[PDB]
Amino acid sequence: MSSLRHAIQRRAHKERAQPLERQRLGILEKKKDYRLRARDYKKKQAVLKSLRQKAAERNEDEFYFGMMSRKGPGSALTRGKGFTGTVDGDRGNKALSVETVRLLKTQD
Amino acid sequence: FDAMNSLVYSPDGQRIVTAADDGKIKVWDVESGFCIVTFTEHTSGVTACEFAKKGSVLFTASLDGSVRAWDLIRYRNFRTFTAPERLSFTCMAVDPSGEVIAAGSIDSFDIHI
Amino acid sequence: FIRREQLRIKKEKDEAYEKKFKRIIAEIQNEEGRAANEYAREKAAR
Amino acid sequence: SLLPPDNEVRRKHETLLLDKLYDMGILSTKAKLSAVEHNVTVSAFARRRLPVVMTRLRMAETVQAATKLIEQGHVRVGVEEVRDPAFLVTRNMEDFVTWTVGSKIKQNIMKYRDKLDDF
Amino acid sequence: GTPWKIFKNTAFIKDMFNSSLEIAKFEGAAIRTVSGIRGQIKRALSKPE
Amino acid sequence: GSQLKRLKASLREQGLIGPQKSKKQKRQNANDQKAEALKSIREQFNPFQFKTNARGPKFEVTTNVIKGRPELSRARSEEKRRQ
Amino acid sequence: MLRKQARQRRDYLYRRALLLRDAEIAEKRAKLRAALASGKPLDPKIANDKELRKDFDYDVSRDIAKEQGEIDIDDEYSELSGIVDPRVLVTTSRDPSSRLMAFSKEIRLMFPTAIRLNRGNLILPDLVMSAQRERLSDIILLHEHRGTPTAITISHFPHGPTLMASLHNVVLRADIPKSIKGTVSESYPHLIFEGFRTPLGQRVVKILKHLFPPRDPTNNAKSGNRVITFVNQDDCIEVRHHVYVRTNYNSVELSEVGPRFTMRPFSITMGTLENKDADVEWHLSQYTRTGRKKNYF
Amino acid sequence: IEELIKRRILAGEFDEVLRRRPDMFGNPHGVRRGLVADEKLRRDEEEIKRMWKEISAKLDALSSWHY
RNA sequence: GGAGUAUGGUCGCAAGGCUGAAAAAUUGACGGAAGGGCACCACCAGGGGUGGAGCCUGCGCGCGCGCUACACUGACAGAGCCAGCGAGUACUCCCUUGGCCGAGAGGCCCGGGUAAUCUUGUUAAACUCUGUCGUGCUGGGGAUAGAGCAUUGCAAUUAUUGCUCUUCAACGAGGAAUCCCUAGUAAGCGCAAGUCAUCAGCUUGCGUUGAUUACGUCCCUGCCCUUUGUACACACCGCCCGUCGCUACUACCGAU
């Protein structure tokens, strides 16, 4: 049980460190750090597998009405060197009319 | 009393034969305007009908899955063709020798011979 | 050859150990539970 | 059901009925007659209609917009344009419903994807 | 030993043996990382002995 | 020729597979070897028991083709390791 | 066409999930039918379910048909089992060697209806595309190490399973001389399978025996002169290819005509060769504790 | 392996899939296409055949002859 | 207490040797002749390997996969200048632009990137052009070898790899054979990954450039099949052949 064990039965076992001749390579990854690494990789691969399923089973004739108010991801040919697959969003700025810029420049 | 799906002249040119979605095909004579025989073995709408070069045999495909083959000197379908998996043929052609029938449907993309 | 021999020996040894101790624990539990139920029956009649 | 269970015509017409309903897309399985007991349903027919099946295929966004688009006549099923919003799309014509030829909706999709070929 | 080049799974491991004879003796052996990653000695490497 | 066809032809030559002879044909056979040839047939038509090259010899010298038995050699080596 | 392949694969996966739930119910319904015929008393949780009885009255007959074996299970092979001759193409890896191309020819000649294709510069999704575009039943890919083959990939189409296996002890047809070998007979081969007993073994038996065209069942027990043998020990299926004459009613002379393998499968995926992200059905569990003790197939 | 092959060939049992007829369902007897109480149960079977003719016509006409 | 499901014991049957290792058939056994179909394991037209020298996995000085060449559709030197699949650094030193220094390899100072955002338009190689060389083992080829400078690494000797000078071998299209190949196929070229089996002495992807010659015929070599069936009109064909078995009947022969 738990009362049938001495304090030397309860005593913790220490963890060894990376050798000092090899400490420049980083920390010695043990089971806990390996579990963190494996959890992050399995999570990222699960998201990527779901994205690959969604890109495979895509209707080529789909029509949402946000397509008339968004700029598409395009291709590398149409966009150019600045091509990421992400749809570009708006930063909030807008082209500003001349009367309001006349007001702002009088204030400045 | 349905939509006339297809028609072909006879190679003589005296009579034409039309195939409608009523299930019947019938052979009209050009002079006198009367149908002279109504073949009624199809149990669904009849698509394309075709002749050979010889003009004595008529091959008719339909949506009940059968390309039938009638002989117009005896008025009986000497052949009926089906695909092993069940299709519904919507178009067909026949060699002018009269020995090979090809037919194609909308359910499978293969073309049967 | 040493791989195949050691894997055969490990399978046979683990199977023999599992069989022997299943027999031993079953016989011990059987005899002890039989005597315990007989004593509970002879105690409940008093 | 009321036929005896080892009957040949019962078994043949069970397979025929289940295959017909699964080919029309009403049932989602073809291995139970309780599907025709409590799964065949006027809502199953009405969701095999055309604006709901193109809502599911994401040709439109909502069934209201889909009925508007197939009343304006952008949607063909196969090779023929469909103006009736009650055309029951079967399971093998859900692979052939698409936009019409000179469609402004098709130009909108191609202009979004930046593949607007004007030829 | 110590890893030398690390690919996705196959890693080359350097400071453990001295010759391909010793590696050919210890072929197929259960090698292990400190972290807990198991592995198997697959093949001796030619150019660094 | 095929291996099937040459096997059938060699067994017809050895008389193991031919037509059902009458009693008169068996009288002729008892009026007028085959295991020694059947050993060669069962060795020749199962050529994967032994290792052979396909090219033949590189330089022909004339002076007066099974080059090794891997199955028998592996079994012999495993018996040596058992001992 | 591609939308139809995707739609039919999705319908197949949904029907398989519904079959899982319906099997969980139909294990309870088979106790009610056996208790009705034999009169042994059944569980109250089974006998007091009104939905189960009300639906049991309609769904007797498929359980009786499955008991008699009159119907076949929902499978990717049961649609076209003995109706169509399965066409199958054998291909190499990208830049094959001469012994890999001769081995590809040899295992093409193993199947009487197969064809061989030169890879060259052929991207693997377009290979899958051309297979579905020409309605092939099976593709088989080959991988060599250095003039000796080390892997097969048997993929069933339109959406069927892959079996990837590694080859060992390959003795080629192209090593023995033409005086001893000859042109292999192309008759429809008999098949024998020895040692497959698990449902996974019947799975690999199905995806291996639906590569061959169906034999005419009128007099197949005595006619036909060519046999192909798949026999497994320690889940490494070993395959021979013999040709035989029946030299008597009690004896038979065999003659080894084809290549010898002992292929070991390491991956059976419910999805074709292009899908690297398909859900696996079985894979060779190395680096586990008792994965070497446990024998599958 | 060779003796297993010889046993199967002699007492011939082969695991090849056999060529089945494509119309085993509708034509189970396999007739040739050329020159050629229980009454309650028969009446019930004929009623189901009549019902299925009507219902199959309605369902094919509602799917608009794609079937 | 009833009903199931298991687990391990106990008992009974199985568990008594005219013995001593290596058929079925009215449906069967084997062929022949004629006529078809198919095949880069066939013909025909071409192409390409391997086989010559060296290295080495594998299989049982010998062997196999390879790389590089024998040049003029070329080598060299300028100059033009064009991809695609990839990858990349946290409790860290990964992918690296630009600025100097250096002939080079490299060094050094900074810098962008956990990334469609930075490397990277990966300005890749064959390739294209304007030159030099001129058929000579020649400037084709670059093995072997000396001396030197660098990088990785705790370590480089048995030379990890990189650069410079020099040394400049065999190899003049591979022989007999043997094998493979019919369109984005043969062949050239690089870039990336390393996926529970196999694979670094390599494997598998990915792009780029992209031909000649067949695409007919069963004449050779073969393989499969018809001569029974499986549908009916037109139309055509018109009892394929041998050696035996088995069964039924008939009479014969000679011992008991």
Give the DSSP letter string of G148-203.
SEEEEEEEESSS--EEEEE--S-B-GGGS-TTT--PPP--PPEEEEES--SHHHHH
Closest-CA residue of chain E to G289: E38
Rounded to whole angstroms, what are the CA distances from C3 to C10, C43, E24, E28, F72? Answer: 11, 59, 14, 9, 21
Strands, E assignment, chain F: none
Which residue is nearest nucleotide I187, judged by alpha carbon to C1' distance? Answer: G120
Using a CB–CB cut-off of 8 Å, the residues of G that contact B are 1, 80, 83-84, 135
Determine the 3-state secondary structure of D81 from DSSP: strand
**Cβ-based neighbour number of residue H55 at 10 Å:** 14
Verify if strand I has an atom below 7 Å from the CB of C26. Answer: yes
Residues in chain H whose C lies over 2.5 Å from the next residue's N (breaks after): 36
Chain A to chain D Cβ contacts (< 8 Å): 38
Instruction: Count, in order, helices (H) and strands (E) of chain H.
Output: 2, 0
Out of F6, F16, F52, closest to residue G182 by CB: F6
Tell me chain B's radius of gyration from C-alpha atoms. Answer: 13
Half-sphere exposure of G181 (CA within 13 A, CB side): 19
Rounded to whole angstroms, what are the CA distances from D63 to D69, D85, E16, G13, H25? Answer: 10, 10, 68, 27, 41
Verify if strand I has an atom below 7 Å from the CB of G120. Answer: yes
Rounded to whole angstroms, what are the CA distances from A49 to D5, D101, G274? Answer: 46, 35, 14
Rounded to whole angstroms, what are the CA distances from G252 to F10, G188, G256, G257? Answer: 15, 19, 13, 15
Rounded to whole angstroms, what are the CA distances from F56 to F60, F81, G98, G106, G256? Answer: 9, 34, 18, 21, 22
> How were these coordinates obtained?
cryo-EM
Scanning every strand, the nucleotide with its C1' closest to B81's CA turns out to be I231
Pairing of strands E38-40, G88-91: unpaired
**Cβ-based neighbour number of residue F16 at 10 Å:** 17
Determine the 3-state secondary structure of H29 from DSSP: coil
Indicate left, alpha or beta for G225 from its phi (over 0: left) and psi (-120 to 50: alpha). alpha
Residue G158 preceded by cis peptide, ω within 30:
yes
Residues of chain G contacting residue F53, judged by C-beta atoms under 8 Å apart: 175
> What is the spatial distance, in angstroms and rounded to an integer, between the CA atom of D94 and the C1' atom of I135?
73
8 Å CB contact between G219 and F37: no
Verify if strand I has an atom below 7 Å from the CB of G38. Answer: no
Do G292 and C7 lie within an 8 Å CB cutoff?
yes
Stated length of chain E:
49
Between CA G78 and CA G29 the distance in angstroms is: 25
Between CA G58 and CA G45 the distance in angstroms is: 20
Which residue is nearest nucleotide I60, judged by alpha carbon to C1' distance? Answer: F68
Rounded to whole angstroms, what are the CA distances from G228 to C46, G156, G208, G224, H12? Answer: 77, 20, 11, 12, 14
Helix orientation angle between D8-24 and H39-62, rounded to the nearest 10 degrees: 10
Residue in the block written with tokens 């990717």: G76
Between CA G69 and CA G78 the distance in angstroms is: 13
Between CA F32 and CA G158 the distance in angstroms is: 65
The DSSP symbol for G29 reads H
Verify if strand I has an atom below 7 Å from the CB of F10. Answer: no
Cross-strand bridge partners of residue E39: E31
Of D3, D32, D2, which is closest to residue D18 (Cα–Cα)?
Answer: D32
**Cβ-based neighbour number of residue B44 at 10 Å:** 17
Residue D38 forms contact with A (CB below 8 Å): no
Residues 15-44 in H having a C-beta less than 7 A from any atom of strand I are 31-35
Residue in the block written with tokens 């890896």: G93
- Compute the CA torsion angle A45, A47, A51, A57 (nearest 10 deg): 90
Between CA G209 and CA B72 the distance in angstroms is: 48
> What is the spatial distance, in angstroms and rounded to an integer, between the CA atom of A14 and the C1' atom of I3?
57
Determine the 3-state secondary structure of D45 from DSSP: helix
> What is the spatial distance, in angstroms and rounded to an integer, between the CA atom of F34 and the C1' atom of I176?
37
Measured in angstroms, the resolution is 7.1
**CB within 8 Å of F11: residues ≥ 6 apart:** F17, F41, G245, G247, G253
Pairing of strands G190-194, G226-233: parallel
8 Å CB contact between D60 and D54: yes
Tell me the shortest Cα–Cα distance from H50 to chain B, in angstroms: 15
Residues 42-71 in A having a C-beta less than 7 A from any atom of strand I are none
Nucleotides of I under 7 A from a protein CB: 3-4, 7-9, 23-24, 28-31, 41-42, 48-52, 57-60, 62-66, 84, 91-93, 115-118, 121-122, 154-156, 158-161, 175-189, 193-210, 221-225, 229-234, 242-245
